């Protein structure tokens, strides 16, 4: 009987197939001839965009050890070409067919296919991805439409991409909204560029959940009164977060849009704009669009007449060309029968770590957990190690399964509390999830084993990417020592991130929120760095039109739109004048002082005013008081 059958081969399955091949475990892959969304986008010439996630978090460790030389955002073409390279390596292991049904029994499953052939396997892994309505819409979009109005009832990374393609042709965008969370995908730290995933230092949650909450949440929840942040200039961007009940922040179930702020876009791309646009680097700065009025936010109950295609706002009956509403993704699962009889109903909270459904036996799910920030690779690489160990080590399979229902209950109590289930439950902070899996497998690090300040920087501030856990032990990858060294040298050993936590250790949440927004450029949604890029935006629109071979008449003044913008931006016009120029920027000065201190004691042993108080905090990091995670235990 077949030891392992993997159903679906795209991107998520690659690291699991690698480990099964290494241990020479018997496996077979079954994957559809139709392919993936990337295949159909490639065939229609629509891989003309870029990822919302950094290279280090979006490609697997065994590629990074060869190819990493700098932080950057890959293109969609680069991502798909990597899928195809690995498909070519493993194609001899792939049967091209479509699984229609799985009958699950006590220790094996019977797999049915559209061709009529059946397969038996002890262990079955599903890696089939999601269906998304927005995908078809992206695949049929005519990007030459010009001088029209669009109404959106949803906002998300796919809607933000469509908006980026519409803005250059003088199209006007109305968002009927109940709020959204958007975050600059690259920020400045003392002028230097960092991708947002580098700033999260997740293991500081072990110091205390309250400290970590202060470190992370002021850009998401409306905690600062600073008139420069977008959620004070445009209050309709604020979401209702009354559902949150967990003390673990950012909460499981929070989602965010990641976008290019125009200042960092200028820094990277101004010298070769037409080529960068043609490669897929599109300016998608939703904060710049709100600043300029090219997008307006209106209340969710603003009335729409769908027969006449009008929306009524500011006393104006505004005609619109197209209405856009996204849909809920759903996992692409075949029929699955419990004990060969009872249809299985998929529920994220009823699985362990999104991988092990407790209602089935020896069936595992790979690729159905989504990261809050960064790429899917971090998640699926760790899931693959977890699945590989469950399949190949019976003692580990038993250790996890013997108390599986108790582990799931404990996980849900920790991360969701009494909150009712939500459709976005499957989204997790990536550096909590990777560390959780590492502790379950046993490839984690121990804070008490740090000897020097440099060791503490690696433990707490070096990002919890999957490759962090593949230097030593069971799942070691050749070349990770050099990769970690290069990343450390290019980021000053993450001292600047380490010092953030040091700086807010004694603040309450209001003080920490004010401190976060006291920088000359704070990380997220800083509306002081938009007006100065108006001339560049004109240059960008011209470049975009040249690449798409479009001529756009922008001579006609749309006074009606200008009136609607004025109504929509009343709060901005009252709040923005309160922005004050400052002589000193507390956060910039505090971080600069902290970096100098840390780099000066980098190689000091831990056992050997501000400096004294900082050294005391550092010594306490060897014995963090909030390390317990009850769902890791075997009891
Ligand atoms: C527009 C878009 C942009 C994205 N951008 C990013 C980004 O910037 N960063 C990031 O990290 N992720 C991004 N993703 C998410 C993610 O990386 C992709 O969704 C990725 O394709 C998921 O890989 P997968 O292997 O899980 O699924 P897929 O790539 O969809 O592969 C699954 C395969 O299984 C096959 N299959 C399905 N059902 C069956 C069956 N019953 N029998 C046999 N075969 C079957 C399918 O035909 C397919 O070939 C994006 C996704 C989309 C749609
Ligand atoms: Cl990177």
Numbering used by the authors: 1 to 608, 629 to 655
Wording from the paper:
The flavin-dependent halogenase (FDH) AetF successively brominates tryptophan at C5 and C7 to generate 5,7-dibromotryptophan. About half of the protein forms additional structural elements containing the tryptophan binding site.
Structure determination was straightforward for non-substrate-bound (empty AetF) and 5-Br-Trp-bound AetF (AetF–5-Br-Trp). Empty AetF was solved in space group P43 by molecular replacement with two molecules per asymmetric unit. AetF retained a tightly bound FAD during purification and FAD is clearly visible in all chains. Our AetF structure shows a large empty space where NADP is bound in ZvPNO and AncFMO2.
